[PDB]
């Protein structure tokens, strides 16, 4: 196999480029990565999808991991902080851990894409 | 009759994480106390008698991405209300929302008729 | 009567000087006045007390108005913003209005001292 | 046996405006999701077996003014737990609280034995 960076995608160029929004914006920095999530989302199934480069079967550089509800809306993202030095593997694992932990606080159920697996009361209806 | 909102928008079910309500005259004001630091846009559907809001059917408060975070509407089983109730309810909602550092803008129709 | 400033008090020097705290801090500025309140307080009776100067039966300058729960804890305050020009009567009336409105959002019941009258689900028990 | 908390502190009833819970092993983690931007101090009462936390009775999270905003404690009807459950519950609580921009400090006893 080649030891050089190879680009892996879960997301199309629309999905990774999409402007998305948080009803209740929260964020956490870990190393060179920024984690953002919408604290309003609850009781949903959430799918993690990522675009990233690998070296030999292992994620090296994350471009973006985004969290999707079944309707295809984006509710969270892990992305590099531009002013920081490139992130470590520890940063990625930590970032995914806190994203999952954050989302499960609200009884969301998380699943990760195959690429990720391989290479890396609460509300009241008005009336 | 003025319609800032589509049928889908006024009919949409919506939820509050921290539900709070105030009643004024025949109007109920519901707002999600959990919402903070958002630009909020007020849109309303209501009748106009000559040149002033007469009967309010619904005023809903929207984030830039279209999430509903509050509503003023008649109490279903006791809907009778006045233009005064409406003015009061709006002041109440705007004050509630601004306490959580949200910024409010009203539709052109609301500014004009209310 | 004298037309010159006269000092009226609802609060002792301990009460007006007390450092106090907000579990959920909120604030609103109106003119030359700052209004702070603890958004966590609910379903309580709240008493407004103020120290201020009057000219002839009318409040002129507010030093501090503080909101007290029956146990004597402070849960809100209206006070002058030091960097601003002295506030107007309109500011005081507006500040009291938003304090009361803010507190009643949480089903608190407000009463005001005699001096003020004269001169001026929601939570779940763990388990 | 270590006691960061007094009898009053551990026995105090407390409430959440936005209640959230996670269970890990025999431990329940409850936290008020509405609390933000606070310095939070963790205090715990627990047994020590030689030189490590053995059994957790209660860990509670306090604001500077002594308000309780979260708790780790055994599920009353199924309290059996391990030192591992405790380490997990603490990571969970700290993460939950930090998501809302709270800053965490742990008692000297917690740092030492946990």
């Amino acid at each position: 196999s080649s030891p050089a960076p190879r680009y892996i995608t879960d997301m199309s160029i629309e999905e990774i480029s999409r402007e998305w929004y948080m009803l209740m914006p929260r964020q956490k920095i870990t190393g060179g990565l920024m984690v953002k999530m919408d604290q309003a989302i609850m009781d949903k199934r959430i799918t993690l999808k990522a675009n990233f480069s690998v070296l030999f079967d292992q994620l090296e550089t994350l471009v973006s991991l985004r969290a999707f509800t079944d309707d295809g809306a984006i509710v969270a993202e892990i992305s590099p902080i531009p002013s920081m030095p490139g992130h470590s593997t520890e940063d990625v694992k930590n970032a995914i851990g806190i994203l999952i932990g954050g989302l499960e606080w609200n009884d969301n159920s998380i699943r990760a894409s195959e690429n990720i697996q391989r290479f890396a009361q609460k509300r009241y209806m008005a009336r």
Side-chain angles (χ1 to χ4, degrees), chain A:
Chain A
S1 299
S2 178
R6 186 173 144 255
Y7 203 66
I8 307 289
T9 61
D10 280 334
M11 288 182 283
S12 73
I13 186 167
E14 185 286 321
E15 294 168 309
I16 193 175
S17 292
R18 199 146 95 208
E19 292 182 9
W20 64 283
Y21 313 82
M22 289 166 285
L23 181 54
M24 290 162 66
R26 302 289 182 272
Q27 69 173 46
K28 258 195 210 181
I29 293 172
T30 185
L33 297 177
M34 172 67 76
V35 191
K36 292 178 178 185
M37 66 160 280
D38 186 350
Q39 185 89 284
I41 307 298
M42 65 184 48
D43 308 300
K44 302 290 203 206
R45 179 173 79 191
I46 305 295
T47 303
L48 309 183
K49 297 189 180 186
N51 293 2
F52 54 95
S53 55
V54 301
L55 305 177
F56 279 133
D57 284 342
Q58 181 74 43
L59 184 154
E60 146 70 22
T61 284
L62 180 64
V63 178
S64 171
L65 178 156
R66 291 168 163 213
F68 292 80
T69 45
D70 284 351
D71 67 350
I74 298 161
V75 300
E77 182 174 23
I78 300 168
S79 61
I81 302 162
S83 61
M84 293 276 76
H87 44 93
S88 65
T89 292
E90 180 183 43
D91 295 342
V92 180
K93 306 224 176 304
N94 282 343
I96 291 175
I98 71 171
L99 176 55
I100 290 179
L103 293 167
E104 292 181 339
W105 267 111
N106 299 131
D107 295 321
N108 300 293
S109 60
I110 321 301
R111 67 179 180 177
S113 74
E114 299 300 338
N115 282 148
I116 290 171
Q117 295 182 41
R118 176 169 149 84
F119 296 112
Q121 148 225 9
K122 287 187 294 297
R123 85 221 262 253
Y124 304 79
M125 177 172 37
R127 57 73 176 168

